[PDB]
Design an enzyme around this catalytic site. Structure first.
Site, PDB file in Angstrom:
ATOM      1  CB  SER B 678      -1.048  -0.076   1.117  1.00 35.77           C
ATOM      2  OG  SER B 678      -1.562  -1.393   1.211  1.00 35.77           O
ATOM      3  CG  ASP B 756      -6.390  -3.874  -3.622  1.00 39.41           C
ATOM      4  OD1 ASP B 756      -7.213  -3.261  -2.903  1.00 39.41           O
ATOM      5  OD2 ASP B 756      -5.232  -4.136  -3.236  1.00 39.41           O
ATOM      6  CG  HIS B 788     -10.134  -4.951   1.277  1.00 37.01           C
ATOM      7  ND1 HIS B 788     -10.543  -3.775   0.685  1.00 37.01           N
ATOM      8  CD2 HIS B 788     -11.259  -5.572   1.702  1.00 37.01           C
ATOM      9  CE1 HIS B 788     -11.862  -3.694   0.744  1.00 37.01           C
ATOM     10  NE2 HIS B 788     -12.320  -4.771   1.356  1.00 37.01           N
TER      11      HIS B 788
HETATM   12  C1  LIG Z   1      -2.802  -1.731   1.892  1.00 40.55           C
HETATM   13  O1  LIG Z   1      -3.229  -0.972   2.747  1.00 40.55           O
HETATM   14  C2  LIG Z   1      -3.494  -3.035   1.520  1.00 40.55           C
HETATM   15  C3  LIG Z   1      -3.452  -3.185  -0.010  1.00 40.55           C
HETATM   16  C4  LIG Z   1      -4.045  -2.030  -0.803  1.00 40.55           C
HETATM   17  C5  LIG Z   1      -4.969  -3.049   1.969  1.00 40.55           C
HETATM   18  C6  LIG Z   1      -5.237  -3.328   3.441  1.00 40.55           C
HETATM   19  C7  LIG Z   1      -2.679  -4.124   2.230  1.00 40.55           C
HETATM   20  O2  LIG Z   1      -2.196  -3.794   3.303  1.00 40.55           O
HETATM   21  N1  LIG Z   1      -2.517  -5.365   1.694  1.00 40.55           N
HETATM   22  C8  LIG Z   1      -1.817  -6.422   2.242  1.00 40.55           C
HETATM   23  C9  LIG Z   1      -1.776  -7.626   1.515  1.00 40.55           C
HETATM   24  C10 LIG Z   1      -1.088  -8.744   1.999  1.00 40.55           C
HETATM   25  C11 LIG Z   1      -0.423  -8.688   3.223  1.00 40.55           C
HETATM   26  C12 LIG Z   1      -0.446  -7.503   3.965  1.00 40.55           C
HETATM   27  C13 LIG Z   1       0.253  -7.353   5.307  1.00 40.55           C
HETATM   28  N2  LIG Z   1       1.473  -8.168   5.447  1.00 40.55           N
HETATM   29  C14 LIG Z   1       1.994  -8.028   6.816  1.00 40.55           C
HETATM   30  C15 LIG Z   1       3.159  -8.994   7.012  1.00 40.55           C
HETATM   31  N3  LIG Z   1       4.225  -8.843   5.995  1.00 40.55           N
HETATM   32  C16 LIG Z   1       5.125 -10.011   6.099  1.00 40.55           C
HETATM   33  C17 LIG Z   1       6.458  -9.823   5.386  1.00 40.55           C
HETATM   34  C18 LIG Z   1       7.124  -8.606   5.593  1.00 40.55           C
HETATM   35  C19 LIG Z   1       8.356  -8.348   4.995  1.00 40.55           C
HETATM   36  C20 LIG Z   1       8.950  -9.300   4.183  1.00 40.55           C
HETATM   37  C21 LIG Z   1       8.312 -10.519   3.967  1.00 40.55           C
HETATM   38  C22 LIG Z   1       8.955 -11.446   3.144  1.00 40.55           C
HETATM   39  C23 LIG Z   1       8.365 -12.677   2.889  1.00 40.55           C
HETATM   40  C24 LIG Z   1       7.137 -12.982   3.464  1.00 40.55           C
HETATM   41  C25 LIG Z   1       6.484 -12.062   4.289  1.00 40.55           C
HETATM   42  C26 LIG Z   1       7.063 -10.806   4.563  1.00 40.55           C
HETATM   43  C27 LIG Z   1       3.706  -8.729   4.616  1.00 40.55           C
HETATM   44  C28 LIG Z   1       2.538  -7.754   4.514  1.00 40.55           C
HETATM   45  C29 LIG Z   1      -1.135  -6.393   3.477  1.00 40.55           C
END
Ligand SMILES: *C(=O)C(CC)(CC)C(=O)Nc1cccc(CN2CCN(Cc3cccc4ccccc34)CC2)c1
Ligand SMILES: *C(=O)C(CC)(CC)C(=O)Nc1cccc(CN2CCN(Cc3cccc4ccccc34)CC2)c1
Ligand SMILES: [Cl-]
Ligand SMILES: [Cl-]
Lengths: 812, 820
Positions: B678, B756, B788
């Protein structure tokens, strides 16, 4: 044998290499020969034609002067005289008046040349046709019986306009533009999506060539037309051209298994008074429904009129596209449209039972009917006969010309008693069916190929593959005493020809693997002792070749005797600067679907210039026409009926191994496959079926799921999805995603975001299933010239990183 | 310093590694007194909770004892309130006087009774389906506080009511024809539109009047204030469908920035009930003058409701630029019946007094922006022309603090008889008294469940705040009469999320820290007899116990640094597991860095941010930095990027990266990746675009690439109207600057959900347009049938796999360095 690795250029370096080596124009076409009729002058004919004189320039009308004699020591190079002062795709013309009619941009225009007015020696400012209509006008046509009248389509309805009197008139009220497209899914005079995309028919209305004279010294003009109702047809959404305007354009796509549009014939009957004013316009419909009169007919493939205007004709197909019927339709079969049921019954009774549709020809096949543009109708000598030339693959499994005479009988069926007619109640007895041509080769009747008939000498000119499947050639033969087939074009080139209407000249657009495209004029003539014998003579050049350009090295055509019992042909691009004792990475370029031939003796250095570019970087490039390919007869083509995706890659691999055994420089460890549309489909099938042979697969706009493609195409080769449950499954890569590799850097998907023949849904559903199956992929999207440059750059780089260079060999 | 190169796993092996290494805590609490002298229990608490693992969210209860063995720790047991349904419950209503619960579970709406006059069950109660004739799904049920026999709900964007005893159903609004298509029929009633739900966190659009009005018949009147919206002028957009079989696109109304917002108004349904609970009549009533006249300049109804007595309907209103908040009291007498007959309509206008008028009881402005919050407490009205209430605001000091405000309800200078439009300040009220309850370099919390409990007896107010730290949320308490000492009630070394009893003798806290998973524990409040102001807390019992520090998860170290910007900037650092001496590791910067969010604090991150630990195990440094603009540091800290989104954020991210890089030699600055979703995807692009030197790869997830494609409520708050700020929008939109990306491949990865509906795929597709124009390379991954976030676990599994594999092949591994 050591592995050759390609020079590992950067992205910016590859862009420069492609930009340098990049630095075409529509060749002269739509020829028309007009006689000068000038004894004191030096020119026999004027030829008019459409062309693009430069690469930036827009497509427009040109003319050139055909001299009565030439200096045979020299080569005459004809000069292009502009006829006019946006851009023109086609033009209409009335002989007797010398009137051109043509659309250029939004406007419809007209000029005169080569009629009673005479022959201009300079460009003509054309006259804009007037209109009240607010929207774009399409598909303009001169009335053959009166060049003052034209017809055209506006907002899916037929209009007519007088270019002298300025009288404009809407003829059909079938479409309301302001309403929503759910309720109003109708159209008159326009061909629907499937008919345009899969049967190459673009017009849906036809002027009657002759006018009937009224009692009071006026006349009646007629327009046969197709009326469609797409209300029951599936509606699909594809993202609009403007991505800033986040919306989707709706249109009717008859996907395989679902309903095609609800079709029928109609006739507009236009009464005009003594001085060109419209008295009245009666719209008329068939006496009985389309489904009753034409039992089983699903598609109106082709339609027109006989030369006298006596009958309208039509070539009709059933849904499986295994039965073709040529059918004459009297104008008396049509009655006025009346919503009042009492007055409608009156008009049905007034028509005799003798007036009935006449199936003048029927044919069937266990494979499929390929529609073509050959159909010549002779003038009617006897009253109850029609004589004509048609082409068919249904007798011999090869397309040949046949002279047919049919008897126009009274029908056994009678409408007075009011039953339904039986299947064969409108069939005519075939009095005669002479075969004009025969052999293990075909007459050509698509993409501009057609015949020209010389009714005086009783000869027919045609294009064909008699001398070879890798070269098109012009031939001529008698249709009365058919025998010896004289070739008129020179061997060593493939030709696309246009015969003058006076059968005394012909033009040929020719090339071969080494020499670019040329267009030349040839004079026809006979020895004094025998008009049947036809000889040719070079007259002049219309377009000169650039001359073999040193940067482009052409391929070698090869061939091998396949275990399938067919000779299969291929093209081989050997790498530039071969090293002895080294083996190079091989890129197989593929299409492999029906209605196409990639391997032939034509210049490939424009369309497939970038195959030569791969060879300059160090790749071997192979192209193979597998079973299903065009120009080898119907049995060869039928190989994959119900079995799409299940035989093509065998033929590719077989040819790829044939090349390997004979050329040690092919490295079967590093083989990539690439294609667009059916080629993209087969590329996915290659990686799915034969991981062992194919390291990488670049699929462009791939068909991944046959239930998403249209009726007209899919049902021809695969039948209805209920009657080939397994073939649709086994032939659909989206439902076999589990069979793709678990290694990355082996699959590249390319798709246009807005493409509306092969929808993005084919890619997006595949992606969905690949994600379900935990499989990797690489994806490039091309929403909305500049992107083609990007495509070539990405592809060269992808092949470099994952096939060609040493880094690719490390990566595994 | 040698470069560490991560193990080069295959795609199958990373799928294994992730697969191998792969529930709602109690909430919506409510204390109900027993009033049983001989019993051992003071209160019973009701709450929503997921009992564990694959199980539905549902109502539980526990017993609060009068006394406890202070030697031992009491563990309360969860009693299921409901029986199995002859799906899950997100939310419930309660009526105190009757004991009636009301809630939606799956499609159906149900009720039970407990803790009222009927007493307290010792066994699960069977839920009682509220029967209906309505064809479609019912949404947003609400008990009438004035009569717990009546409920209300939304069905096909119209308001309905249903008696749960008499079984009488009734439709109150005929605004939406459910059968006709949405291009023509774009009106609704009682329903918060897209921007209100998505950007102001308001979900309901109708509010029961909490008191009845008696009639001559011995019957009563019930009222519902409701929002009516007309989205006919709002931009329509088409996104595809969960069904990819039908190549089709579903429409909805998305007010993109600088375009029309929904045309809104207030309405009231007047509902006459007879002496035995049957509907006599329903009069639908509208405002005596238009919304644009009575509420000059207002664009968003942010919040709304009624005063405790049902006398006034309150509302909190915003202008379009969101720099002016107004609290407004709307009297029921402002509403007249709807009438087509324009003579009869005029006669009703004249019969209403001119003295009856909107009362702007509060108004405030700011150069930065108004942040909407759920804190607003009206006291009972004793004086006639005075209203007394607590509110919170950043507008005075630049930190959100509580203020006790009294306003005088004057009769308006403006008069309706004359027939002119009112002047901007004709409805404004005198502020008689405005006492600050709190103050300092720290904020009171009023979003995401944080609120206040007012003890009207002892004249105190409980609240959450950042006074001890920005890294920890704590419960405090203070007097609203003599505001002085702010007493903290929660223990330090823990972030808390607290729910205070309605009786103010208890509070529950959900708490955690960086090393310890979440816990829920009950605490009793009491005062020494000599001084009821002095509030102390004692542990009472455990509701939810810690699973314990799980040995897979190594927490990160919260660091901080003094930025040249003049702010302390906090961060988190995940060191690589088995950190080798004299070696340097590939770093991965995880980022969000947008407004309304703080990633760095003292909470457990082993659940939500588990894979940052998985990255550390493979041998990646992982940094997280809350740059300027982020939450919980005051309005000035947040305001840093007003009109300038995408410009300042990466400066702080690079500064923090270099603070760590100079202070730790294991951070390889030659191999630094960035990744976010996002705003984090947006910044990931901006980071690579601006700082090719610092960042090797960027993996942008659902990025905003063009601020004109984002909605009104968000974009205009931080950037103003595009007309007024052409440079801000251009400089803040990565799609317009596609020429600045690298011309090296394997440095840019775009990840986007195809369907989305918050950050549309359009952002990604238009970025791809300009990248293709600019001749720039990219990599792309699409996740169809997902809205989302990534809900389907197989696509989540695929996301994590590709993301890990991408970092491996183009940053972490041996081959990644060889590839340049
Ligand atoms: C934005 O506000 C969105 C999309 C428009 C709407 C709510 C959004 O947040 N989407 C979204 C999609 C999928 C996952 C997440 C949150 N998630 C949190 C944990 N994070 C794990 C992570 C972090 C960094 C690196 C890695 C590498 C490999 C696997 C996981 C990892 C990912 C994002 C939000
Ligand atoms: C399918 O039939 C389509 C799409 C639905 C109908 C329009 C289709 O054919 N699309 C399409 C798009 C773009 C290009 C082409 C044809 N083009 C011919 C030349 N070829 C060059 C080429 C060939 C092989 C390998 C390379 C490698 C790098 C660069 C160019 C290469 C590309 C395809 C058709
Ligand atoms: Cl022509
Ligand atoms: Cl509650």
């Amino acid at each position: 044998l050591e592995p050759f690795y390609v020079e590992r250029y950067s992205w910016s370096q590859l862009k420069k290499l492609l930009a340098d080596t990049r630095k075409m124009a529509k060749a002269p076409h739509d020829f028309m020969f007009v006689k000068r009729n000038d004894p004191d002058g030096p020119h026999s004919d004027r030829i008019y034609y459409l062309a693009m004189s430069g690469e930036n320039r827009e497509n427009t009308l040109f003319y050139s002067e055909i001299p009565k004699t030439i200096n045979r020591a020299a080569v005459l190079m004809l000069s292009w005289k502009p006829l006019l002062d946006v851009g023109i795709a086609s033009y209409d013309y009335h002989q007797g008046s010398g009137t051109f009619l043509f659309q250029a941009g939004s406007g419809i225009y007209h000029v005169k040349d080569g009629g009673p007015q005479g022959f201009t020696q300079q460009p003509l400012r054309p006259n804009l046709v007037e209109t009240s209509c607010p929207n774009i006008r399409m598909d303009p046509k001169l009335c053959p019986a009166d060049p003052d009248w034209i017809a055209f389509i506006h907002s899916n309805d037929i209009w007519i306009s007088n270019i002298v009197t300025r009288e404009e008139r809407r003829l059909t009220y079938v479409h309301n533009e302001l309403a929503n497209m759910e309720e109003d899914a109708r159209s008159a005079g326009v061909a629907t999506f499937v008919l345009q995309e899969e049967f190459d028919r673009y017009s849906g209305y036809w002027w009657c060539p002759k006018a009937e004279t009224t009692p009071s010294g006026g006349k009646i003009l007629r327009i046969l037309y197709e009326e469609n109702d797409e209300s029951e047809v599936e509606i699909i959404h594809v993202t609009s051209p403007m991505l800033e305007t986040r919306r989707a354009d709706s249109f009717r796509y008859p996907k395989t298994g679902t309903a095609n549009p609800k079709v029928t014939f109609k006739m507009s009957e236009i009464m005009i008074d003594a001085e060109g004013r419209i008295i009245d316009v009666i719209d008329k419909e068939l006496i009985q429904p389309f489904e009753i009169l034409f039992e089983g007919v699903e598609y109106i493939a082709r339609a027109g009129w006989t030369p006298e205007g006596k009958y309208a004709w039509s070539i009709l197909l059933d849904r499986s596209q295994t039965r073709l019927q040529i059918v004459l339709i009297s104008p008396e079969l049509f009655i006025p449209v009346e919503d009042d049921v009492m007055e409608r019954q009156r008009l049905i009774e007034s028509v005799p039972d003798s007036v009935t549709p006449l199936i003048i020809y029927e044919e069937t096949t266990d494979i499929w009917i390929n529609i073509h543009d050959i159909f010549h109708v002779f003038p009617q000598s006897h009253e109850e006969e029609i004589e004509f030339i048609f082409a068919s693959e249904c007798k011999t499994g090869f397309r040949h010309l046949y002279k047919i005479t049919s008897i126009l009988k009274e029908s056994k069926y009678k409408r007075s008693s009011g039953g339904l007619p039986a299947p064969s109640d409108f069939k005519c007895p075939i009095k005669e069916e002479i075969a004009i041509t025969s052999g293990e080769w075909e007459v050509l009747g698509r993409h501009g190929s057609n015949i020209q008939v010389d009714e005086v000498r009783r000869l027919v000119y045609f294009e064909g593959t008699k001398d070879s499947p890798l070269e098109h050639h012009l031939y001529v033969v008698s249709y009365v005493n058919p025998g010896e087939v004289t070739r008129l074009t020179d061997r060593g080139y493939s030709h696309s020809c246009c015969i003058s209407q006076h059968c005394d000249f012909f033009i040929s657009k020719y090339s071969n693997q080494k020499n670019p495209h040329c267009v030349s004029l040839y004079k026809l003539s006979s020895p004094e002792d025998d008009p049947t014998c036809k000889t040719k003579e070079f007259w002049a050049t219309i377009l000169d070749s650039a001359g073999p350009l040193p940067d482009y090295t052409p391929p070698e055509i090869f061939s091998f005797e396949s275990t399938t019992g067919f000779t299969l042909y291929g093209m081989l691009y050997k790498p530039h600067d071969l090293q002895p004792g080294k083996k190079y990475p091989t890129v197989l370029f593929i299409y492999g679907g029906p209605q196409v031939q990639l391997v032939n003796n034509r210049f490939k250095g424009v369309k497939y210039f970038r195959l030569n570019t791969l060879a300059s970087l160090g790749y071997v490039v192979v192209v193979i026409d597998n079973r299903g390919s065009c120009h080898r007869g119907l049995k060869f083509e039928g190989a994959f009926k119900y079995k799409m995706g299940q035989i093509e890659i065998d033929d590719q691999v077989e040819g790829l191994q044939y090349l390997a055994s004979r050329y040690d420089f092919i490295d079967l460890d590093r083989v990539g496959i690439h294609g667009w549309s059916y080629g993209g489909y087969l590329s996915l099938m290659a990686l799915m079926q034969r991981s062992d042979i194919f390291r990488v697969a670049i699929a462009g706009a791939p068909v991944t799921l046959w239930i998403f493609y249209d009726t007209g195409y899919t049902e021809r080769y695969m039948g209805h999805p209920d009657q080939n449950e397994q073939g649709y499954y086994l032939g659909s890569v989206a439902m076999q995603a589990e069979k793709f590799p678990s290694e990355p850097n082996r699959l590249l998907l390319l798709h246009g975001f807005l493409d509306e023949n092969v929808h993005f849904a084919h890619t997006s559903i595949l992606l969905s299933f690949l994600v379900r199956a935990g499989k990797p992929y690489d994806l490039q999207i091309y929403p909305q010239p500049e992107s083609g440059e990007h495509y070539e750059l990405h592809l060269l780089h992808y092949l470099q990183e994952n096939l060609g260079s040493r880094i690719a060999a490390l990566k595994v």
